[PDB]
Amino acid sequence: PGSQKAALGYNILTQEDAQSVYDASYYGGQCETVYNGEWRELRYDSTCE
């Protein structure tokens, strides 16, 4: 998440982000994974308590 945001172009004059310069989505056959250190999302199961 947010990888698309680093792929944007950038308008120095406006400091606005522009259309995607990089491909935010192409994996090129790579199977590379990034550990999501904040994965740890609290859940409650009323049945098990």
Partner 1 sequence: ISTIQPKANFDAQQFAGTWLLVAVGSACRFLQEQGHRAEATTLHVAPQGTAMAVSTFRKLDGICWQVRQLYGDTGVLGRFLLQARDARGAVHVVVAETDYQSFAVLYLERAGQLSVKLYARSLPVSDSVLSGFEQRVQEAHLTEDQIFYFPKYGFCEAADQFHVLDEV
Q: How far apart are CA 14 and CA 26, in angstroms?
A: 28
Please, what sign has the CA dihedral across residues 13, 17, 21, 22? positive
Footprint of partner 1 on this chain (CB under 8 A)?
A: 42-49
In the complex with partner 1, the residue whose CB is nearer, 31 or 43, is 43
Pick the closer one to partner 1 by CB: 32 or 49: 49
We find the least distance from the C-beta atom of residue 34 to partner 1, in angstroms, to be 24
Name the minimum Å distance from CB 38 to partner 1: 15
**4 sits in which H/E element:** helix 3-7
